[model samples]
Target: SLYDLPPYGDATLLYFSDLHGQAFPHYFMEPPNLIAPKPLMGRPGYLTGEAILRYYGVERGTPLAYLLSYVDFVELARTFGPIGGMGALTALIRDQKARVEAEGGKALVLDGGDTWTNSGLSLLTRGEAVVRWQNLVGVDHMVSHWEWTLGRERVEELLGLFRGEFLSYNIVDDLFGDPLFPAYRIHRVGPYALAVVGASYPYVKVSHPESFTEGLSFALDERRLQEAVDKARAEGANAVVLLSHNGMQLDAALAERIRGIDLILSGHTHDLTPRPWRVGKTWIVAGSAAGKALMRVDLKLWKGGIANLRVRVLPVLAEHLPKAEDVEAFLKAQLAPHQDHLFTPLAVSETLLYKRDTLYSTWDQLVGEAVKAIYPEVEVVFSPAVRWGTTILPGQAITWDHLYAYTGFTYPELYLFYLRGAQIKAVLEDIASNVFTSDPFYQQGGDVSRVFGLRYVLDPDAPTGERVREVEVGGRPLDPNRRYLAAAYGGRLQRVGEAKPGYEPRPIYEVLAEYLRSVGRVRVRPEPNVKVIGRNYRLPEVTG
Candidate 1:
């Protein structure tokens, strides 16, 4: 059985996070650039490809290797079949709970947030479908991230259907400073009591659009989180866990600052953690995004002391596994009516299509070319640094559902505008400051934005406004005084750029589909116009 464990345990937490609304078995490619500044390059979450395999001490051609890294992705996809589904996860969770109970041990199913609203179905239902599925899966405690972008009203409506409580300690009403969601919950299972405190992503306003969180304000107050842990301890909790939507780097910083947390199950940034790493007194583990993997955590409760702590990331393989019948039926019924719409073919790809690297991807290149052809005079184009998207194998036919995997958002509208050369330089510097900033909390959690048409070398260690060096426009030195035409989508340049209404406004997905129809075969390659040098400076480390 997948849930098999050694000896005795006081409690078991069946943990998963960052589903991003993948309800069925599908393929996902690990990022090629799970990277950072030079000093931080070799960290667990930042490692990719062969670095990942070496860190885990796994062989190059194994199934476990395939799920955790992007090496030989096409061949591995054929062998492993597909990655994850609600049906597979449900079976994993249910069977694990039953096994734990039979051994006279307590168990809980914990979700670390970013559960809803990325798939075509989740977008069409306004994230309602995923909530209903979670209710059926018997999720005991959960938290949030991308779920907030559905807007407060829609989120409230979805919460009404959720069987588990949505926990977020940091979010508050901007004016009154009242708590928006329950901060923590204490649960009694078998002979032990456990406390699970929630920490939502703190920089929601900075990381996302203002309208996404609306009137909500989030703070990463160390005092408040410590107080919550103390309160749980005072209430006779046998163990304490922080279920956080804070990306792994920031959580590592938090663990170094705070005390009394036994473990931190983290989400956002989707860092692959084959095993949990320790910082101070806490152990941190990350769940795979898109339901590609779930974790089984067995804890040895020993008078509030950290001992006998074991964590394993279980791969959600699509081959030779028993599917949970009810959850499968639920997905079928929900998706049956929308199958034709979602399954509409876009085109066949001659090359692999993915969106995860820090700088560029084939998919971004495809989008960039479409916009460039439409507005030939445009000197530059930008695409949002989106981390969520289905990995399309080379021979696979890209579908409408595949587009929604990456493009589904409240604001997917397109724009064509103009920016001065100086303004363009500022844009690059601002995004760079957010990504490479020494303090992870100050860093808005995502990759650097992808650009086309213009090229520049970036020195990440340099100060603001000076990081961009040797900029060029159309094979010539950039003229700071010159105004250049531009195009962009996915709300990256909402505030910048003087408006040019002559270029009609439409959804970016629509534009992509239109361009795909005319192009018979998809063989896209990114322009060699992006570079990052001077990564030698020492920065504060976000350990493991």
Candidate 2:
């Protein structure tokens, strides 16, 4: 039988990942799906198992995000810390074990990569707090992404801090062509020595090398991964598992091509899969960002290496699960130590307010305001990213914790440059094209350009040259000869005057926080919302 492989057989592995610093249930960007007036409500998030059902051939179920309202998310987060941080995560693990025991089964938890580095506080501490929290959460094994971005030395430091073992089959040490860490581990659980392998994002250098490994190297060869599986099987392990951070679409592709991997608990694309996706006998699963939910797969070995896999998506909402006291205490301690410094209500505002949207996020706008204020002569521009944190709802207080989330990235540094009108248009055109590219392969997954005092009509699906058809600033088309000031961060290009580090890195959110406190509550409606292209493009169905 599947559970009767070795010493204390009969086990279930619980897995999940991609919880972007959303400890509190709060709304950031309003759903683009809802606004399109689609024939059917576009699903809330596209990378989930729910999305697979809606778009692919998977069976359908209501997306967990649909039942959740922006306000409900906020309330739940405030009370439980969105999956109650890691302590609450372990509590759920215990609950699952009780179920397993009743059925004569064993359980182990594997954290797929991308667990840390998404939130403000985590970034503020450079993932140290999260590392502590994950240890408290208690996982059997783990894999990582975004973790490597801080460089290998820091990666070693984090691994030292973690209680769980780090495993990655695809990552190699460039100097020796050996694994950066171990490729896999055989942990003896119950009577079974289960073989667990790890795979980091294969496109490490292509997508974001700066975040994966500073000098270490990566390769996308699936052959080496299969070799790892072969090695595990050679060691006499019956069941094999892979913890992956290769995102859903690419993971799906990987699943189809590789064999011997019984299950792949994946992350990196922020997908939420309620049920496992089986591709050529391999099972794949993912948990969406911010620890809002978990993916549980219970497998029963019927006979002769054949297994029965049953899956359920566990939602980490307050309605059902209560916060575990110890975990809550830990979080309290974590936050308590920094309470005065991290959660202070900064500045005053004057109306019902919202933040973090494409083109016109109030927070982005405030940042734009600061860039313009500080560099009166420079034409300020902000990236579509730096806009993926919580929304300070109508009456809520804007705290420093919230501020850290938006500005937590390693390179939140901003730089200014002088560009002719034509050059400015080219920069806008470059970023704008990225957002509107017809091919998903070409688009870099960012939002429309955020400009303080510039204007353009963007047809997202239109071909190049025709896309930004109308470009005007202060009432006239861009002049090729005239020069203007420009600003951007996280760019590979050259520049001058990088923002000072470790200060209020994001000027706009700071301004918004202050503005909100002053007004009591603020109301902001989108202005000159850039029109999306294609009639087939419908706003998704989601509640903020």
Candidate 3:
């Protein structure tokens, strides 16, 4: 009948990446991270189809399958509603793993980094249990993009316990030839000899800060990657696999440039490719993040050379399989310790709340205010590099968790700088181009730079200079040559050392946390008092 094709002789390999550890039932859309045209796939990345049937005891291929995937498909086509969650996700993984094993084939699970510290609970627990659950999930190996967020010590602790190989190719020691971790690992599945090369992400240093990685270097020496691949081949490995955290866009780019790499198990960008990306000669596959879906590639190895490889991106349905109990247990234990401190309420106050409704947000305002307070002489500017934290509705209590949620990072340091108003303006121009450049790659996150206590209007819809042309300070035109004390949060000129004397800079988040505790429940109202500069944004006249 050709209902299903065998995966062993014609073995089926299962793939998944970036389970940001929504290990319990929760809703997530397929093709994650995109907002506007949201796709409601269902809960746990598997709240539909045979997923719901298996999880809640409904029979698969019966009315239940229609009830889940089909019904949701109908609803999704109509209105943007609920999507995948963890309950449904776990069910799907179990089912898929079983399907692959039953065919006398081995299922390889690759934990594609960023597996630590993102969830409400994981942030609370500090990523201990997530590592344990990953161990239980039976990952053959894992690699990193966000592993450095927990600091080097924690990363080593987790690595010691990971029941899998961890690989990174793009990572280079700042001083040595050997990579930060062992560059690669080897595995044998069925009759195939596989060489898995680990590649870390480049741009991590400039992406965040070196402080986030106190003792590590994130390098992009592509020449070294080719050399490593060649070495693996010489060692008699028949097939090569790249466990990549370079992201999807880079994967496509790298595949076109690199030669001889048979399959790339990639992650970091978290793009949901309905199918695998084939560039030149390399096959690229990345399972989407946070346990939502898996990407599987089955390969046929030969004595002559690499033979064939097939790939698929499978969405996990929580409704169709059972949750891994070991993972649940580890998740629970890991989350238990931080429960008390994380949810504590904080009372904060702001004369003008911040938001990124194409302009600014309340949390952004909080950041700006902190920067200004830290360096009172300087006019503080906060990089609107963040997306979500607090959305103060009509009088919602702002908690410590809410503030931390918005500003949470492995590294956040504030620096005071002496910038001539012209240089400041130039920096502003640079950021403006980065955001409103009309290119998705250039448009990084929400609005422009958040200026606190300073009033300036911006037409985000306008191009470049015309967008923020009317820049002023306290009702006077900006003087580019006038040197002004400026405070910038994160991404600074120097990671350490002071800009000037008496400008004692502190960790931005710590200052914010303290300020939050001092105020209690914060109430913020957007001022009608803000000076208008430019236009091009749709905004709600905010009410506290």
Candidate 4:
């Protein structure tokens, strides 16, 4: 059975994160080239392609290879079957619970946030169906990021329907500085009392619109987090854990700074960490995103403390596990109405379209091109570096599912406006600082803002504001005084600057859909718009 494993523990923690509302078994590719700083502290210097898997002893041409890296992706995906579905995940969780129960131990499930509202169906339903499905799956506790895009009232409504407690130590009321949700929860699992603290993504207002988070303020309140941990210990908790959405890098830093936390299950950047990395006395682990893998940890307790722990990062292979019948029925009923609409074919791609890279991505290129097609007079198009989306393969029919994957946001409004050339450069510089900041604490952890029709050179090694250079529009130097027409989706410009000629907003998906329909068939060749200098960084060339 899939639940069979070598274990010596009194309690089990089944954890996963960043589901992003994927209800069915689907394809997902792990990023190949993920760069890290020099003099890496116990972390791998470069997590690229098969090297990451090789580091974990995952052999090539195996199921683990297909699940952990992008090498031999398509063929391996076909052989192993699609990775994860909610129904299969439910079965896995239940089986693990049964395993723990049979051993006279206790088990609980934890979602490390980024739960709902990044799918075609989720957008249409305002995350209502996702919440219901999560309820059916019996999630014990969770946290979130993009859940705010549905607005405060809508988010509160979803929370009311949720079976799990939404925990966050940092999400606070802007005026009162009071917590928006409980800072932590104490779960009595068999002989051990576990204190689970939540750390929601701290840059919600920066990444999302201000209007959506009107009364809410977010930050990494390490002091408060430590306070909560101390309180849990004072209350006789045998173990303290943090269920965080702070991404893997930030969580590593957090683990070093904050003491008394035994473990940290993190998400947000969506890096798949096969093994736990210890920072100081704390262990941090992050499962793969989009329901690709589930992380399980068993803790042997002795004298009110963990004696030993065994961890496994399990890929949710559909072939190896049977789906939970109730979850399948629930998903089918919930997704029935949106089926025909989401499957409607929009275009065809000649090459794979993906958006997981830290720099320019093919999905961004598709969006930029579509935006530019709608407004030819616009000299530039800018799109937000949103981290969530599905990947499309070559020769695949680009349907509503594929289109929505790129443009699915509650605030998917497009703006066509004008900005002075110098101001545009400033915009690029600001976003560049956010991406390429040397200090992990200062970085918000997002891909570079995608640009179309305009090109520039970026030196990530240089200091902020000075990194962007050689700004050009169609082979000519950018004139500082010239005002250029531009188009962008989401991301308000209130703090950045003004958009004088802005028009009434249109949903980004509608614009992209219309543009794709006009083109009928899509054929995009990779063109390096922003060149990286100084560092030996090279963008992977897209091949057909």
Please name the candidate that would achieve the greatest TM-score relative to the true structure: 1
- Which pairs clash (backbone N, Cα, C closer than 3 Å) in model 1? none
Candidate that beats the other on lDDT, 1 or 2, i.e. the better one: 1
Candidate 4 C-alpha lDDT tens digits along 1-544: 4357865687888998888877777767765345443333225323656577778887888776777777777677668887778888888888877877887887878987777877876876888888988888789999888888889899999999999888999999989999978988987866668888898889898778789889888888889988999898889888888998887778877777887888888788887767777777877777568888888888876545566688888888877898799998887787788788788778888776767765667778888888777777767888787667776766777877766666778878888777888888898898777666666666565767777888889876677889889999857999989888878776765234455354677888888889888898887765658777744444433443
Worst 10 residues of 2 by lDDT: 31-40
Q: Candidates 2 and 3: which is better by lDDT?
A: 2
TM-score of each: 0.94, 0.77, 0.66, 0.93
The model with the greater TM-score, 1 or 3, is 1
- For model 1, how does the per-residue alpha-carbon lDDT over 305-407 read when each residue is reduced to its tens digit? 4466677777787674678999988888998998987887888776777787777777888888887776678778888887777777777788878888878
Write one digit per residue (lDDT tens) for candidate 2, span 126-177: 7777777777767777777667656677778888899988888777867877
Cα lDDT of model 3 by residue, 1-544, tens digit: 1113356433344666665545443323221012110122221221323343454454434322322332233233223222224444444555667777887776676666767655555555567666766666667777776667777777788788887777787666577656766777766666666788877767667666466676567766768888888888787777788887776556656676676687777676554444455666876676665565656566677753457766554545454445666555655576567656655556534332433233455556666665565456766464544422333433445554444445555555666766666665566666666555543222223235566645555444455665456566545777877766666664554333237666666666677777667655555544421333432222333342
For candidate 2, the per-residue lDDT at 526 reads 41
Q: Model 2: runs farther than 4 Å from truth?
A: 1-10, 20-63, 67-84, 186-194, 203-212, 237-239, 278-281, 301-308, 347-366, 373-378, 384-388, 420-469, 473-475, 480-482, 490-522, 535-544
Worst ten-residue run, lDDT, model 4? 37-46
Better of 2 and 3 by TM-score: 2
Give the whole-model CA lDDT for all candidates, comma-separated. 0.79, 0.57, 0.56, 0.77
- Give the range of the ten consecutive residues with the poorest summed lDDT in model 3: 31-40
CA RMSD (A), model 3: 8.8
- lDDT, model 2, position 286: 67
